[PDB]
Structure formats: structure tokens, C-alpha cells
Amino acid sequence: MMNEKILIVDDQYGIRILLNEVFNKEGYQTFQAANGLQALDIVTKERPDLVLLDMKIPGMDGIEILKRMKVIDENIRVIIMTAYGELDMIQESKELGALTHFAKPFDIDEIRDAVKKYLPLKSN
């Protein structure tokens, strides 16, 4: 057994696995969602130590989801992902108490730093 979990929501395009195989390589329990609520439940279900969700979402942007999510509790930790075009939102996410903000073009290696910086990860 291990000690690490992570959740992925939207932005799924073969990247979720990339980081998956990473956390999975350790035996960590990771899950995926296709919305906020679904992530809210899957959040506690897998009670991960980190969650990755992308704002850009079909049918009710995450602007609110991520909002209500954090507004719900200040202990919720989730990462946002979107091109550096809606800095406006990305900004708020900061004052919202978000972990950070990544741009479409992102590297896992980089995410391994924040994760390895926030969580007891072991990335090269």
C-alpha cells in the first residue's frame, strides 16, 4: 500500500493518464469526473490529496463550480487549467485560495514540482 491520492476532472485528453501512471505507479488511488458535483462526490469518495479540474467545461463553466467548490470550504484543494486568456478568472482562483493555474500547454514534470512541493511525491 501507499499514501497518496489525486483526482482529475475535465481536460482529459491523454494527459490525465500521464499523471495517472505516475501516481498509479506508486499505487495511489485516482479517479476522474465529468463535472463539478461528480468531482465533489468523487472528491470525498477518493478523498485525494489533490484534484485537477479544467475551467472550460460544456454546460455551466467551472467559473461557478470552482467558485462554489472553494466557497463551500477553504480546505478544498483543486488546480485549474486553461489558456492564459481568461486571466480574469485565473486571477480570482488565486484569491479564492486555489493551488495554482496552468495553461493549456503544460508539462507534467512541472506539475510534479507543485505536487512534489505540496504532497510527499517522489518525482525525478
Q: Which residues are annotated as a binding site?
A: 10-11, 54, 56
Residue ranges of the binding site for Mg(2+)? 10-11, 54, 56
- Which residues, including other chains, have CB under 8 Å from residue 26's CB and lie 6 or more apart? 2, 4, 122
CA angle 103, 105, 111 (to 5 degrees): 75
Q: Backbone phi, then psi, for 30, in 5-degree steps?
A: -125, 150
